Write a protein that binds this ligand. Structure first.
Ligand SMILES: [Fe+3]
Ligand SMILES: [Fe+3]
Ligand SMILES: [Fe+3]
Ligand SMILES: [Fe+3]
Lengths: 439, 439
């Protein structure tokens, strides 16, 4: 029973054309819009092989025996398998071990070993890596030793002679149990972040699709906002709810922040989306921070003016300054540029906007916000990110622009791929004409 | 400028009646529905004080000097302050120290110290507790020592003589830095889970509101499903998206899982909500797993039959058996009953449903799934939860009922309060009359 009657045994991404399959993914709505937009689809099998090969090599390059992952985003990277991702983020029930020979094992939720079976690179599905008080109460320690012994045996068989085990993050009972087994615990995030920083061809294709779906969802939200803002009942939450639904309808997964705000709640930036009733002749600013189709993060920001009056002149200047900030900074991007040189040479925001500027001028992005973080000169730490940009990295380029004690802020941000030659702005979403000083 | 013209300086929960305030919360939509339903609103101030006093007492009772929290759900319990909750769950940028004398400090996101200022119990807003590779690269270790020295000084001043410091979960760099300051690191979750297990009166009021908002959101989803399932395009994701949007519109926060499935995808249970095109004359089953209004978790499950035909007799039996399971198990609940006695005396599912039954027959709930976990007899571990039920505990009571290799499952679950001399089922959502064999 096909989900897409117009295709053969597989969908355009190589997955089975089967309405009843376990595996989820983009909806027919999403696939339809991508085809209309002329987008080439990723091949998921080749994508999954690329990530696994790259992560395996990262382990080998460091002389480690294995990498043990409890962060659901790292688990997603290694296996492309989801399972209650958001519950998993703060309940560590799940683990993946990847050994130096490429052998990969998942410890999954006891009731659902079938969820990663679609990926043959996952060689075993086990259970019992859930080492936290809710799940095991006063008997965490017993299972921690069972689990740590399993990891020892796997490492003995698939990484013999290696005692170095990289771990991204683990509960203290698990840490103690692994150390008891003889492991020297290495920093797993140094491995995962640097590995994930370079996207293969299929990941870039997935991201193009995710970017399109997100921009479409945002367009629905803009449509809702311009039609309903100022009707005396429409709140920030009402507007933001459109983005939630439109993302989910296209096979997206969640939203990381609550960064949509209206009017004076845009300054200081990082106030959260809430019940505030929106008003005519006001700024609405937001940051998608969105985990979208194929599980790819799309992290873009736009600021809107909605009203019958024109925006104030200080608003227009702020918007122009913000847009100038990200376009100038984006021009720095090409392979071989050292991250601290991005910091040293970035566009300078006016004195009045310096106190409230964003936490970085750029950061990586893939399955969520990722390494590197490109700090502004006054916050940058020498020796923290001494590495060059490379083709296949993706960076979001940020501008947060507002005065201390001001009654609005501008937030703009684009998602940019590093190419062989330089860069490609993936983001095609319009900038507000009125705020840009146009008409 | 009031957000509610009909009230004075405060809203019904005692928060400022101010459309432009920083603090978020339930929307006017939610408040209106609750007022119409005759629900008493929580007093947030009294609620926050209750939690803080109880958490401090927990630290004192154990002979600890303090509790350091990086889990966003624990931070929300201690402070009632949110900040990019979902981003926070897998990016540990945030921390709260609560000392034995009740002194409480938050290290927040550098750019947003203002987010917890509404709670005067939070005595200081700092920054620099973000000890992970994305945020600090190769210089995590330097700040980890800065942060650990700060914790030492606070503990010297507010818990003199104490070397025991409970920690829920911390990055390894943080762990080593704290231990280097002379702290003995204790299990923080044992403190937070047992503290959070007893709800004060305002928390229970808050939960009654969240439950009502959730059931309203679910009713919208049921209306959408019964109207649109079987139209040849409506997908699981389309249906589920209604729950997302209606939650956000009422001031809810997120959904923890993807547990909605249609038809044969309901068996085995734990398949994820996806692109599947729904069909007339099929089961749809779901678990809300919802973080709702006031940040209260509402975790209920229902199973629907949608179609012009009657459900099969085995579907009716399974549904009635599931309903019998949770009503029988619920009837065991009262103060003083020992958790392992719930396990020992629980309703027995038929043999053919035993393999695929849920991971527990009950579990606690508050800001999310919480201690205790009441396991079925064949999984229960002696000595893991040797504790009695107490008034103020809230337990979800569930049933997953499906045969190995079967083409459907039933999922039912209600949310139940322990009272002074028994229990009160908080959940009023209907059971499908056709599946119950009543229609
Ligand atoms: Fe962002
Ligand atoms: Fe960003
Ligand atoms: Fe649940
Ligand atoms: Fe549950």
């Amino acid at each position: 029973r096909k989900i897409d009657p117009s295709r053969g045994a597989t969908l355009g991404d190589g997955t089975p054309n089967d309405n009843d399959r376990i595996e989820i993914g983009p909806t027919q709505l999403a696939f339809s819009e991508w085809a209309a937009a002329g987008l080439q689809l990723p091949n998921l099998d080749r994508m999954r092989e690329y990530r696994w090969k790259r992560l395996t090599q990262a382990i080998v390059d460091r002389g480690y025996g294995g990498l043990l992952m409890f962060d659901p985003l790292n688990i997603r990277y290694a296996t492309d398998s989801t399972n209650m991702q958001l519950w998993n983020t703060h309940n560590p029930f799940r683990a993946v071990l990847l050994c130096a020979d490429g052998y990969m094992v998942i410890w999954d939720y006891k009731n659902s070993p079938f969820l990663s079976k679609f990926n043959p690179l996952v060689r075993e599905q086990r259970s019992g890596a859930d080492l936290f008080y809710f799940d095991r109460g006063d008997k965490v320690d017993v299972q921690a030793d069972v689990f740590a012994n399993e990891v020892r045996v796997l490492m003995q068989d698939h990484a013999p002679g290696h005692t170095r085990l990289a771990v991204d993050k683990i509960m203290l009972h698990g840490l103690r149990a692994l150390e008891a087994q003889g492991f020297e615990i290495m920093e797993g995030e140094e491995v995962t972040e640097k590995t994930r920083a370079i996207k293969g061809p299929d990941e870039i294709l997935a991201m193009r699709c995710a970017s399109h779906a997100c921009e479409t969802a945002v367009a629905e939200m803009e449509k809702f906002a311009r039609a309903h803002v100022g009707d005396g009942k429409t709140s920030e939450d009402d507007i933001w709810a459109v983005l939630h639904a439109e993302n989910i309808k296209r096979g997206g997964e969640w939203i990381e922040t609550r960064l949509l705000a209206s009017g004076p709640r845009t300054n200081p930036w990082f106030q959260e989306c809430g019940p505030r009733i929106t008003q005519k002749n006001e700024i609405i600013a937001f940051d998608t921070d969105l985990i979208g189709s194929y599980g790819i993060c799309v992290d873009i920001s736009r600021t809107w003016w909605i009203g019958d009056q024109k925006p104030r002149p200080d608003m227009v200047y702020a918007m122009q300054h913000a847009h100038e900030h990200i376009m100038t900074n984006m021009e720095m991007l090409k392979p071989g540029v050292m991250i601290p040189d991005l910091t040293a040479n970035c566009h300078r925001l006016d004195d009045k906007f310096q106190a409230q500027k964003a936490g970085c001028l750029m950061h990586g992005v893939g399955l969520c916000d990722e390494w590197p973080l490109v700090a502004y000169p006054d916050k940058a730490v020498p020796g923290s990110y001494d590495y060059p940009l490379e083709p296949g990295m993706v960076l979001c380029v940020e501008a947060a622009v507002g005065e201390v004690g001001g009654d609005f802020s501008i937030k703009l941000e684009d998602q940019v791929l590093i190419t062989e030659d330089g860069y490609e702005n993936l983001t095609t979403y319009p900038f507000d004409a009125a705020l840009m000083g146009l008409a």
